[PDB]
Design a protein around this ligand. Structure first.
Ligand SMILES: CNCc1cc(-c2cn(C)nc2-c2ccc(F)cc2)ccn1
Length: 265
């Protein structure tokens, strides 16, 4: 199917917040792309608002390039460069187990992605593994951050901060606290409040950070304690948090070579 004079629409990949994702080809450039579709007539149009956020974020490391934006038939269309699998897909492919080196390589980039979004006056509000994608080819070592559908100028229950479960307005600290649960999720293979059948808020609040992080380097606990200590309007010390993991990376004797667990398959 023809899209905006130069794109050929392929099949559905998955779904984002407020729209389905499809494979595509940029016919003029000879490159595969990813296409997000939104019904023109939806009660709450958001595709064009999100495109403006991506546009403002352009130039930042690990911010995907948006190639075209417009309307075609029954849909609002956004075209993005093709990226690789999400960290959730890669975690599942690695049998839900990442080495400490992989977790630390990912933490370094992920803290930087969040800091960049915050430097652009936005909070993401949905920090989770499926919102981080690895690049392809020459950009294969790069962690990209996606989905600005829930973003706000200053989510998922499993990774929500305690302040979020309390019903408090999300701020910079909440994006970082979510990353801290994402990091522990990669370390454990699961979180203690996962698969409960409300109950998540109670389980999170009754699980001390020292119990959550037991058997893992103290840095994961120190990271979460720092995020929980941040005030609503506080500018987080991103450099301190990256240095916490960097010092542990050096103590372990690891090389910053971008060779992740999946690269060894
Ligand atoms: C997973 N690799 C294919 C892939 C998927 C995506 C992708 C995923 N999700 C949940 N959303 C998007 C997306 C695609 C286009 C767009 F305009 C806005 C967002 C992106 C690139 N490459």
């Amino acid at each position: 199917l023809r899209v905006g004079n130069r794109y050929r629409l392929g099949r559905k990949i998955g779904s984002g917040s407020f729209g389905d994702i499809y494979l595509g080809t940029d016919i003029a450039a000879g490159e595969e792309v990813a296409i997000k579709l939104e019904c023109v007539k939806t009660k709450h149009p958001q595709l064009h608002i999100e495109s403006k956020i991506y546009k403002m974020m352009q130039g930042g490391v690990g911010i995907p390039t948006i190639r075209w934006c417009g309307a075609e038939g029954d849909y609002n269309v956004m075209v993005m460069e093709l990226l690789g699998p999400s960290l959730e897909d890669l975690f599942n492919f690695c049998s839900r187990k990442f080495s400490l080196k992989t977790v630390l390589l990912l933490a370094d980039q992920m803290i930087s992605r969040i800091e960049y979004i915050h430097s652009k006056n936005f909070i993401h509000r949905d920090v989770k593994p499926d919102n981080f994608l690895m690049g392809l080819g020459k950009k294969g070592n790069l962690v990209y951050i996606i989905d600005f559908g829930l973003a706000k100028k200053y989510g998922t229950a499993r990774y929500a901060s305690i302040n979020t479960h309390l019903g408090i307005e999300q701020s910079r600290r909440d994006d970082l606290e979510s990353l801290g649960y994402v990091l522990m999720y990669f370390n454990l293979g699961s979180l203690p409040w996962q698969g409960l059948k409300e109950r998540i808020s109670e389980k999170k609040m009754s699980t001390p950070i020292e119990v959550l992080c037991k058997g893992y380097p103290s840095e994961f606990a120190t990271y979460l304690n720092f995020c929980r200590s941040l005030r609503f309007d506080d500018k987080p010390d991103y450099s301190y948090l990256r240095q916490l993991f960097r010092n542990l990376f050096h103590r372990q004797g690891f090389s910053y070579d971008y060779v992740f667990d999946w690269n060894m398959l």
